[PDB]
RNA sequence: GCCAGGAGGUUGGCUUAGAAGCAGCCAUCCUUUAAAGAGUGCGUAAUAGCUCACUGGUCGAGUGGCGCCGCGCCGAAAAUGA
């Protein structure tokens, strides 16, 4: 018997394998993580991928439950500002440009994940995290 | 290290204790077991 | 020791059956090799000289 | 000290997936041993001493009893994963009939399900009779082992039946040396009656066989039997050809063969080189009774170097085989390190004059060849080009002027080895009627190549292997350590089943006898496969270090 | 000294089999906040964890660093007995 274990991970969409540490954490669970793969992939079917957090539990009598979250902002800018892998080193080379609407949605999408669950900080917040990956900005 | 003329504080988790007459340098991992000698 | 021609492996033991018979080649060619012996078993696929060239009875199963 | 139950039990469903139901519990831990309780047939077989001259079986000495009882109950309840009587019996609270235990248990046992951890002690004769009884209770009979697999005289499936009337059909194993009755073959038949003093025939490489006398190693002394039965085991005399694993039927016995084909794969590679090669073919006779007594090892010679590589699967393996050498075969061979297949190349575009401005008797044979040379990737192949600046050098040299290039390539400018993995090119030349031959521009090519390779930025491409590491995560971290410490860098880690295999790059010179290592770091979780990839440069210092003389 | 918070974008980007504060080049942020770094050490296969930084709770009087001058101590063993 095994009483309650809610272990949450960082499993991206695409990998349909029980490879450790998914093993030594959800073996003591009886985890239906093959249903987590085939129900969450279609959950974000509009793209069908991207790195997404998860959370899975056991109810004594083997009962899974999947809890999904939202994409990363470094990827939600490679799609936005059109990077390939990025702008090779944040302090030398720059690709596309951020202005006054793309960053808006970079903050919009990730409204309840960033830190300050308030819009009136997020924009400039990750616009500053933009210089961390090296994507330039257009300022008005 | 361990017995030598030059004996530093090297890793911050070390102390210089002028014990039994002469300077030592003791820590946890006695691989820095220095000593003025 | 020479050999029975095409299709060899032999490496370095084989029990090459010292046979006997020179030619206008290799100033010796005396005491040949046989295939079948303790090694070689003839050409990979032979249809005649299977009296030395290993291969048993091409039983092509048809 | 250390003797226990829970110990081993616990370590059974943490190291495989065992389902250890157990049937006997000791009396007194360490030094205080005196007997065992039997939660199987509900008894307490107690051995009142060490040597075991005088024992007993009184009930529980007051404190155990109910302890054992719980586990007894476990048994029955566990037996709810088999039939339908035992399960419903636990439902009823009904008492198990002493033999349904024998059932359900032996059932699962032979069905590979339950784990009759019968146990005891040897040096102090304590706990032997119970497991003798437990062999005569829960240890599978040939009747229980499902249909043996095998081939036919033609080729499909076999049905090696128990039936003591069917066609003669045997297998044998051990190659016994012995004084009186000489070569003795240790065998397990299978299916078919075999008479003593009769005939048979080897169903493998085709060899009629004369059975001399069937024998049986009866502990102390060996006993000669009238015949071997279809499903028994015995060792016969004669058969002066039959090696090991040879399927042996009767004189008729529809010339049937068997399936089973095992694998003693290689892991060790030690070099060995006698003083003078006169003692060598001598040691080849030594092998002529070494690689013909113990299957296993592979006595195969590397091409690029001399000396036959004695390969095998075990450190102590090759070491003790080597013991037997100087022992009773007596060979003087300073057991060396395995050599490596060294190649080479260059790293730059070179242009020189291959002018053979040499008249002799009047026939000349002179060749001014004008090559441009280009080098390319470690893995491509060999390239040259039909590269005439317009139409100078004759077309008879096209398939020959490149020969001397390919020829002055079997030995490089350094220590000299086959210089591969290069393009080449050419571009021009000089021509004359009688003062020019095929081999002349072959040799002009040779000169051109020696100059253009000695002056072309040298190198040595030592070979390197891809080695998958068959081991779980612990010692995986550890061995990522090791491999990294072996001048190479791995590259590979796809999560595996009961382990996690790591695809590795390791420089063939290094990684030497890695099994001798590995089997120590991992304690023995598994090992590796020898997948060979390709070659690349040794870090500067390793190059000039080999520049000997 | 002790209690506790010690955080979120994040796995900074760049590299790299992986480089997640943490083997390496650039960097050289912004925010929830009283306070918490693009990190200081250990440790990891890289994560993990531990951890210092920083800021409150307790506290109750001095404390931390940088340079100089005088005398010293390690530095410091050879031969008949000092």
From Swiss-Prot, chain A:
One of the record's GO molecular function terms:
structural constituent of ribosome
GO terms under biological process: translation
Q: Name one GO cellular component term.
A: cytosolic large ribosomal subunit
The signal peptide, as residue positions, is none
Entry superkingdom: Bacteria
Q: Which PROSITE patterns match?
A: RIBOSOMAL_L11
User: Carries keyword Lipid metabolism?
Assistant: no
Report the PTM annotation.
Answer: One or more lysine residues are methylated.
Keyword annotations of the record: Methylation, Ribonucleoprotein, Ribosomal protein, RNA-binding, rRNA-binding
Q: Name one Pfam family in it.
A: Ribosomal_L11_N
Q: Which SMART domains match?
A: RL11
- Give the NCBIfam families listed for this entry: L11_bact (TIGR01632)
Tell me the protein family, please: Belongs to the universal ribosomal protein uL11 family.
- Tell me how this protein assembles: Part of the ribosomal stalk of the 50S ribosomal subunit. Interacts with L10 and the large rRNA to form the base of the stalk. L10 forms an elongated spine to which L12 dimers bind in a sequential fashion forming a multimeric L10(L12)X complex.
UniProt function note: Forms part of the ribosomal stalk which helps the ribosome interact with GTP-bound translation factors.
- What this protein is called in its record is Large ribosomal subunit protein uL11
From Swiss-Prot, chain B:
- Name one molecular function that GO assigns to this entry: structural constituent of ribosome
Q: Which SUPFAM superfamilies match?
A: Ribosomal protein L36 (SSF57840)
Say if the entry is tagged with keyword Ribosomal protein: yes
PROSITE patterns, alphabetized: RIBOSOMAL_L36
Keywords associated with the record: Ribonucleoprotein, Ribosomal protein
Entry GO CC: cytoplasm; ribonucleoprotein complex; ribosome
Has UniProt tagged this entry with the keyword Hydrolase? Answer: no
* GO biological-process terms attached to the record: translation
- Return the similarity comment: Belongs to the bacterial ribosomal protein bL36 family.
Q: NCBIfam families from the entry? A: rpmJ_bact (TIGR01022)
Q: What is this protein called?
A: Large ribosomal subunit protein bL36
* Protein species of origin: Thermus thermophilus (strain ATCC BAA-163 / DSM 7039 / HB27)
Starting at the broadest rank, the lineage of the source organism is: Bacteria, Thermotogati, Deinococcota, Deinococci, Thermales
Name of the gene: rpmJ
Curated annotation (Swiss-Prot), chain C:
Q: Which organism is it from?
A: Thermus thermophilus (strain ATCC BAA-163 / DSM 7039 / HB27)
List where Basic residues composition bias occurs.
45-56
The protein's assembly and partners: Part of the 30S ribosomal subunit. Contacts proteins S8 and S17. May interact with IF1 in the 30S initiation complex.
Protein name as catalogued: Small ribosomal subunit protein uS12
The family line of this record is: Belongs to the universal ribosomal protein uS12 family.
Task: Tell me the function of this protein.
Answer: With S4 and S5 plays an important role in translational accuracy. Interacts with and stabilizes bases of the 16S rRNA that are involved in tRNA selection in the A site and with the mRNA backbone. Located at the interface of the 30S and 50S subunits, it traverses the body of the 30S subunit contacting proteins on the other side and probably holding the rRNA structure together. The combined cluster of proteins S8, S12 and S17 appears to hold together the shoulder and platform of the 30S subunit.
Entry superkingdom: Bacteria
Q: Where is this region: Disordered?
A: 42-62
Which sequence positions carry the modification called 3-methylthioaspartic acid?
A: 25
The parts of the chain that form a coiled coil are: none
UniProtKB/Swiss-Prot annotation, chain D:
Domain of life of the organism in this record?
A: Bacteria
One cellular component (GO) term of this entry:
cytoplasm
Keyword match Signal:
no
Q: What is its main location?
A: cytoplasm
Q: Name one GO molecular function term.
A: GTP binding
Q: Does the keyword Nucleotide-binding apply?
A: yes
Q: Which GO terms describe its biological process?
A: ribosome disassembly
Location comes to: Cytoplasm
- Keywords attached to this entry: Cytoplasm, Elongation factor, GTP-binding, Nucleotide-binding, Protein biosynthesis
Q: What does this protein do?
A: Catalyzes the GTP-dependent ribosomal translocation step during translation elongation. During this step, the ribosome changes from the pre-translocational (PRE) to the post-translocational (POST) state as the newly formed A-site-bound peptidyl-tRNA and P-site-bound deacylated tRNA move to the P and E sites, respectively. Catalyzes the coordinated movement of the two tRNA molecules, the mRNA and conformational changes in the ribosome.
Which family is annotated? Belongs to the TRAFAC class translation factor GTPase superfamily. Classic translation factor GTPase family. EF-G/EF-2 subfamily.
Q: What is this protein called?
A: Elongation factor G
Instruction: Supply the source organism for this entry.
Output: Thermus thermophilus (strain ATCC BAA-163 / DSM 7039 / HB27)
Which part of the full protein is shown? 142 to 690 of 691
